[PDB]
Design a protein around this ligand. Structure first.
Ligand SMILES: Cc1ncc(COP(=O)(O)O)c(CNc2cc3cc(Oc4ccccc4)ccc3n3c(=O)[nH]nc23)c1O
Ligand SMILES: Cc1ncc(COP(=O)(O)O)c(CNc2cc3cc(Oc4ccccc4)ccc3n3c(=O)[nH]nc23)c1O
Lengths: 415, 428
């Protein structure tokens, strides 16, 4: 892999900090670390689910309130590496560092990793592959970068490989080696329960997508926050699991399973590219909150893999009942007025109103919002709406979908 | 003031999220933010339930059932409302900026919480710099800013400095290469901004005077350039009565000020704040929204509750306690420097912060002496090379930190320094 074609001139330029470096009877007058005996917070005790207790003693608190490495605290990084191995067993583990060895870093949410990755790759006028409708957060990130977003057709089983084949045919495999031909830099995808569709990719489709990424030499950006929210029996193999070449950048998030407000996520990918990301982070946020990482690592030490897997299962059990409750309310009132696909993962139900052309007109909420937001051209009319089942009660859903049905009936009465 | 002549095309392009949010107030009792769409994860799934944090010189902080659910959930990009209002009021009592009641487009004073003051600085640099732009700075400077500016392909023009910081006549001599009218002509390429650490500059420990700041501001109007006031050691000034800040004298709305809690409350919590004109602060909030989304909700609530219970009085008492320690540390480092380094080096007394900047009298390059000979001997310090744009050039200076070493750790270490200096002077 020639990683040089995926790193910008600005990203390449980045150098490591001269004081990082530096970091047993040493006298340190090097590092400008503030004195922790001056910090006002002294000890902490956080209660868990249930009777379980996390404790930050005198010294643990001093560590928590102080600076820490850019990539994350060592104990968190080692625990996460082991999880990635048991879940995905990537081919890249023992590869030489320059050949794309598997590396990890803790980010201030999964959004930070995605952002630094997009900024490392995109030069104004570069072609990027994506599937509409997409997560508004990535569209909002890509827009200022002045790149060309080429939409790939999708259905109930996510990205359609033949659409990607048809698109890619505008270039020749040999063109990737020629810089001035301008072949796609990457393909971005949410493989499980895409925001806003709730649709998931299959094993066969992923295999086919990977085969095209080798052929036309482009990276795969696996944004998988709903990986631990798959409804059906046995999780689908990830792009990272089949990454023989070291062309996959995977983003994981604790936001849907542990806490969204703590701002803790992780990026997995080849060492050359992960390095560039750590060097940018080193000049932005310096590192993710020491306190917030120690909170998760102490919880993880208490739970272990079993305790963590048992917790994911309790979260899946909650979202599965919510999904069933939104589907029942949808069946009761929307039948004859709308069409929808059963969500494979996540927290969203994507509704297509049968008659109407623009649904933004109809709403004029709570759990619903219009399709417009999930497109590059948000000014175009959309008959779709996104309903969230993460918080509404089964009876809150019934009441709301009953209001939807009447509004739909009103618009259909007028020519 | 045309703010647009300073920003990049990418910065302008940024839009707010289509998914609308806000703090409740109309419901239950405890206010927390809600999403008007909305895909907020269920907080009844989060494993952390309640929290109790002890405070030395304050009441014990407590996060109950509902407060914890708020803390573990998403929050606004600019910061939690209670922290933003408290910080705005502090900026008013400390700096009383002229820009407070100005129209928003005229550079009205605005604030935002960042994930450390480094994040604010970063987003600000990225907002302004286009490859080939001229920027004003004083060497030696904070390595973090140099490491930030280097990939941006901008031309760093060094301004001469002394014990009283930036020398206004050097800045006058530099600026003379253009005419005041040139700022209005895009193709003339006049400086976009001047970056400065006004109190206890990293690595010098030198501080700017009131008279010098006034003179610097007068030049920024004349040649129309912003002032980036990176002030983390503002609350670590060793002499009686703090010097007025650039923000305090900002009649035009040309000042972007960065503040940090790292040296006074906690560095590991990653909480800082940016103060400046609403048009430029918006651009910064909009970039943050696509990077980290917002600063940790938990970490903000912790500071907000401490600051609120303390009051400004409580806060000031704590900064006075902090300053007291570093001042004693500064005296110890100066004594150890007097004892061993006299005859071998020269230094200025630090006005603020945690660093002592030593110039070795004889030697030209302090690098192998500090990275090889000194580590072998068990003493850690930094060579001057790191604090320059051209880090490959030899440096006779070294930076010593007095933030943690004991008075006897200082004595032992400076005794090792003297022997190493004496060794190099023996060889021609
Ligand atoms: C596919 C995908 N990739 C990456 C990320 C980033 O995840 P991290 O790992 O960084 O946490 C997400 C998070 N998604 C949403 C966040 C969200 C946040 C909100 O609150 C704020 C607060 C401040 C600024 C903006 C939004 C209000 C509504 C929100 N929302 C929604 O309605 N659908 N999906 C979301 C994602 O879905
Ligand atoms: C003038 C000025 N302006 C803004 C900021 C940013 O302040 P905030 O973003 O925290 O508000 C600073 C921070 N200074 C230092 C940080 C520092 C951090 C370290 O720990 C890490 C950890 C991870 C990555 C990099 C460094 C190890 C040594 C460090 N160090 C040193 O030795 N001198 N000054 C520092 C500053 O001096």
């Amino acid at each position: 892999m020639n990683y040089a074609r995926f790193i910008t001139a600005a990203s390449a330029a980045r150098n490591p900090s001269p004081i990082r470096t530096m970091t047993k009877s040493m006298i340190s007058l090097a590092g400008g670390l503030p004195n922790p005996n001056m910090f006002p917070f002294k000890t902490a005790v956080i209660t868990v689910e249930n009777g379980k207790t996390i404790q930050f003693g005198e010294e643990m608190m001093k560590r928590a309130l102080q600076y820490s490495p850019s990539a994350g605290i060592p104990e968190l990084l080692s625990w996460l590496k082991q999880l990635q191995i048991k879940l995905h067993n990537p081919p890249t583990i023992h590869y030489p560092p320059s050949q794309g060895q598997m590396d990890l870093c803790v980010t201030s949410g999964s959004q930070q990793g995605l952002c630094k990755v997009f900024e490392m790759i995109i030069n104004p006028g570069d072609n990027v592959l994506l599937d509409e409708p997409a997560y508004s957060g990535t569209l909002q990130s890509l827009h200022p970068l002045g790149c060309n977003i080429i939409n790939v057709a999708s259905d109930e089983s996510g990205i359609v490989p033949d659409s990607l084949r048809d698109i890619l045919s505008r270039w020749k495999p040999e063109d990737a080696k020629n810089p001035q031909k301008n072949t796609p830099k990457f393909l971005y995808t949410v493989p499980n329960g895409n925001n806003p569709t709730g649709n998931s990719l299959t094993s066969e489709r992923k295999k086919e997508i990977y085969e095209l990424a080798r052929k036309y030499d482009f990276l795969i950006i696996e944004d998988d926050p709903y990986y631990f929210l798959q409804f059906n029996s046995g999780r689908v193999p990830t792009f990272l699991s089949m990454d023989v070449d070291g062309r996959v950048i995977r983003a994981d998030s604790f936001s849907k399973i542990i806490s969204s407000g703590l701002r803790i996520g992780f990026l997995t990918g080849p060492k050359p590219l992960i390095e560039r990301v750590i060097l940018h982070i080193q000049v932005s946020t310096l590192h993710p909150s020491t306190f917030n990482q120690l909170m998760i690592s102490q919880l993880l030490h208490e739970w272990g893999e079993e305790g963590f897997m048992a917790h994911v299962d309790r979260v899946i059990d909650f979202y599965s009942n919510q999904k069933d409750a939104i589907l029942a309310a949808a069946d009761k009132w929307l039948t004859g007025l709308a069409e929808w696909h059963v969500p494979a993962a996540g927290m969203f139900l994507w509704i297509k109103v049968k008659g109407i052309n623009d649904v933004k007109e109809l709403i004029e909420g709570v759990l619903m919002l219009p399709g417009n937001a999930f497109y590059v051209d948000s000014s175009a009319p959309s008959p779709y709406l996104r309903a969230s089942f993460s918080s509404a009660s089964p009876e809150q859903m019934d009441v709301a979908f009953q209001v939807l049905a009447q509004l739909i009936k009103e618009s259909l009465l007028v020519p």
